[PDB]
Symmetry: C7
Subunit: 107 residues, 7 copies
């Protein structure tokens, strides 16, 4: 899992899971969805890196958790950052958030 | 009573109670309910897990409490998270909130 | 006076008084009252339980005080919470608020 | 002057003075006055009780001061609170505010 | 300069200067001036009293400074406060502000 | 360079530079510029005085820096303040800001 | 890689990378882009200078990172600042941000 990307300070870098609840487009088509609603949607992620300032024993790499879309921020894939590839050809999605935004671990 | 899901930091994971306020829908039908009102509605829940940073002796697993819908956030059922179940066939509702949002225990 | 409900942390649980100044029904009928105004209305209450984190010697059970409606939050009666009574058949009204919202005691 | 009402925490209970800005009613009748303006009007008050958490030597009972209407909150007269008298037949007006809202003393 | 009015806590009481920026009335008449603009106008004042909680050596009585109208608050003249004169016959204007709002001294 | 004006507390007094990037008025005439945009524009300034509470070794008088217009506040020239000159005959523009608003020095 | 510009306090000065997200001009022409969206766009940068108050071992000069456009602020190029060149003939873009806004390093 280790690529050239590390979390600093009190941040934590996670990697989004391939499957998320969105495979239930049960909602009527052509509806306008507000930003609050979109921000509440949970995102299943796996801890990839923990900032050196996150309190010791907070979580561990490999741990699975859930964060609302609105609490996390997308981080450019290290290859795109290191100018090797194009965003489109990257499947893995890295996101970040402050450790205090993490409420649980499916551990 | 426990499942593979634990609270971290200062968070607390509760499990919502079967019966709640919703029963009295004897209100006039077709009225638009604001978000503040909806956020006010209390939710009866039972403590399932207490984050390691919640001050010692704050509460105990099994304790029943009440939180406004607006103070808690829904957490994906560990089963759905661990990819075995579809949220639809899940009855137990897990929610989370910061410990400072808990004002009382029905003990 | 003590029912099976206790305040936790820095919260305080009070019990509203039977009579409130809501006897001044001398307001012109059919007027729309704003939320700020409604939130300003005082509520006479009696301390029923003090959270363990409220500084020692802050107040005592039985003490009468006044809080603006907007500063307190209604708490489900322990009977309703413990699924023994129906809300409608409950007279006592329990409310909660952070101790820092309490400015005085009528003692 | 001292009735059964005491200030707690960092609050201070004052008693409004009989004469206030309410005399200069030279302002054009029929004008709608905003809430900011109304909140700016000073209110002359006398310290009646100082919360035990207000820093020692901050002020003394009997001290006269001035607070903007928007910084203070009306407190029910102890007799109305103690259900001994009615609001209409009460002359003394008690108000409260946090000690940090007090900028001066007319001493 | 010293009348019966003292600053408490971290506040500072100043006395506004006779001539201010306003003299430059060369702008177009009948223009509606916003509140942000008005709040930015500087006010030349002289320190009259320093609260006991303002850090030692912050400033001295007699010191001249400048504060934006929006940062200071008018304080009733002690003669009006002590009920001897109607504000109209008062020329000295006292104002207050927190010490952290003071950026400089003209000395 | 030292005029009779000193910074107090955590403030810093700077003097604006004669030239700023406003020597690029190629912008289409008659356009309405928002406040956010205007507040963004950098201002080149030279440190004239450092408040006694600004941490030691933060910066030095004479140091050149850049601050967004929206982060600084204009300060009346000591000559206008000391009633020695009308504003119009003053070229030097003194400004102030909190030290935490300063991100760099061109030294 | 160092010119005459240094970061002070808790700030960090970075230098933007030549290639950025702007390469995918696939966005339908003539669409108005909101400010939130624009502020979210990541900007790849290289640490050029770390303020003396940024905690030791936070990052190192030369380190590559990613920051949302809305978190960073453009800093005038030292030569424009030192009145040695024109902004138009300057290629290198310097930006600044508080260290707490940095979530990762591509190390
Ligand atoms: K849509
Ligand atoms: K909305
Ligand atoms: K509805
Ligand atoms: K009504
Ligand atoms: K009116
Ligand atoms: K006007
Ligand atoms: K406006
Ligand atoms: K214009
Ligand atoms: K706008
Ligand atoms: K556009
Ligand atoms: K919008």
């Amino acid at each position: 899992q280790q690529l050239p990307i590390r979390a600093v300070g009190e941040y934590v870098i996670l990697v989004s899971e391939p499957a998320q609840a969105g495979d239930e487009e049960v909602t009527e088509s052509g509806l306008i969805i507000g930003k609050r609603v979109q921000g509440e949607v949970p995102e299943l992620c796996v801890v990839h890196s923990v900032g050196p300032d996150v309190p010791e024993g907070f979580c561990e790499v490999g741990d699975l958790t859930s964060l609302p879309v609105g609490q996390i921020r997308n981080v450019p894939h290290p290859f795109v950052a290191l100018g090797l590839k194009q965003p489109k050809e990257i499947k893995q999605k890295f996101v970040t958030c402050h450790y205090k935004a993490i409420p649980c671990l499916y551990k």
